[PDB]
Amino acid sequence: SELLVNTKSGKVMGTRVPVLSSHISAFLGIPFAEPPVGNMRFRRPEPKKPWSGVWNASTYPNNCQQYVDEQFPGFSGSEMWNPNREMSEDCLYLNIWVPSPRPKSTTVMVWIYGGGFYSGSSTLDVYNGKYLAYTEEVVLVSLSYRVGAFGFLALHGSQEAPGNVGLLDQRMALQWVHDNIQFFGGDPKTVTIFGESAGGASVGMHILSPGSRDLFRRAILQSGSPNCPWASVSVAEGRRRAVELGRNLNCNLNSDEELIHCLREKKPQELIDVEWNVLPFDSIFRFSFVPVIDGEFFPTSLESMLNSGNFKKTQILLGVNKDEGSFFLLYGAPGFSKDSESKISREDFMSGVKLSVPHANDLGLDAVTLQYTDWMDDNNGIKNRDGLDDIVGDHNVICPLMHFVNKYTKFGNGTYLYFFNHRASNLVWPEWMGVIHGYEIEFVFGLPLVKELNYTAEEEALSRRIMHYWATFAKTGNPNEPHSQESKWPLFTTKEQKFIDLNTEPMKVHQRLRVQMCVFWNQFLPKLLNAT
């Protein structure tokens, strides 16, 4: 049977799924790790023990325990990101969409979800792998990994909660794909990992980590890079936040054993309930439990690793969206609301700058403010709003990614950069948010090919070009068709630094994606806060 696959861990049984008038196979909820429950909470993941019998892989698995967005109850714009399944610490599963008939050795694409390392599910509608598997005949895999404290609590030194275990969860899924994707017709020598936001930083992290690089071929990073200011912390900060977590649960804090034993007695929701209380500053775009620079997964600091070329050299494709910061401002910055144009006052702008560059002294704040204020129209509320939107996206997504692409390109074997700036015709979020963080995902996963979702025709063509670029690049290391007549996405080089826009219009090539602002964020400001 086409829905029966025998792997190294046991026999698995799929289900047939209709997709665009046709059908493909889907193996939902295949387990790749022992449930990290009980005393295994915070611990490294363990390999799933092989099983006898047939594993029912016809329905989605549980989503990992996470914080749930209740900012707009019933709003699809935000609920579409929430877990659409029962949450459970027993969540280490992966999903596979396989063309029908089953290929023999085809290109593999592994998806790593975003969610700031505190949230995210592999079972979300926008992550449905069937359209991409089908349209590009690639074997699509979506893994899962523990988030929040469960996946990132870090008490360096202890082996009970070493930190980075969520990253390890992902590595174990990539190990399992390496080991078994062949039986599903996947070519293990050609797996491309790709993700968005935290999933993007994750991708860059496996490129960086020595223990992870031999497990994939190529990489795609959407709106995220490993060196992101919000994606990692020192062991001291990790430790400092774990203890704080404990102090919120009235835990004995005399020793790591004491702490950890207590955290393990608490029900998931108690940890999730005080999770946000541990951030060191009042901040926007910062999350409690994230990867830690521990000396193991990350041998040394990310910067020294990038500087030395201490990383997997291969091809990479990555880019960002035009208005990456609007979400974070809508959620916590004063003056922004879902149903108003969110025109910001000078004072709210300033409240905003403070909230966006948390780790900044007065001198630093004045510099960001000077860099983004039109002193000839400083009370223009739309300018203040958009300025603040740029500050958040440049500081948190674009400049770190630009810094990563520039360091990477020096030793890599091929870079392709995009700037995605088409705003979806059916976006339920307000106009002022622009081309929102996370809204290139639906084009990557091909939702515009399904009529009832109401995209325009030019949108479906974009989705197809994007899907074909992603899959062609995964297949070859180049997004362009060997001899197509379509315009060529040029390669990004240290010298030219070319990139392309990604929208419904005829492809345009440009250079130095936000240099002016990224020289400020990657060179000037850091140099200024270090002297002050």
Ligand SMILES: *[C@@H]1O[C@H](CO)[C@@H](O)[C@H](O)[C@H]1NC(C)=O
């Ligand atoms: C990639 O590597 C191959 C062989 O190692 C080399 O011949 C080719 O020029 C490289 N391409 C880039 C963009 O570095």
Ligand SMILES: *[C@H]1O[C@H](CO)[C@@H](O)[C@H](O)[C@H]1NC(C)=O
């Ligand atoms: C397993 O998949 C779902 C689980 O709820 C169930 O509806 C289905 O009948 C089961 N199939 C088999 C073969 O066990």
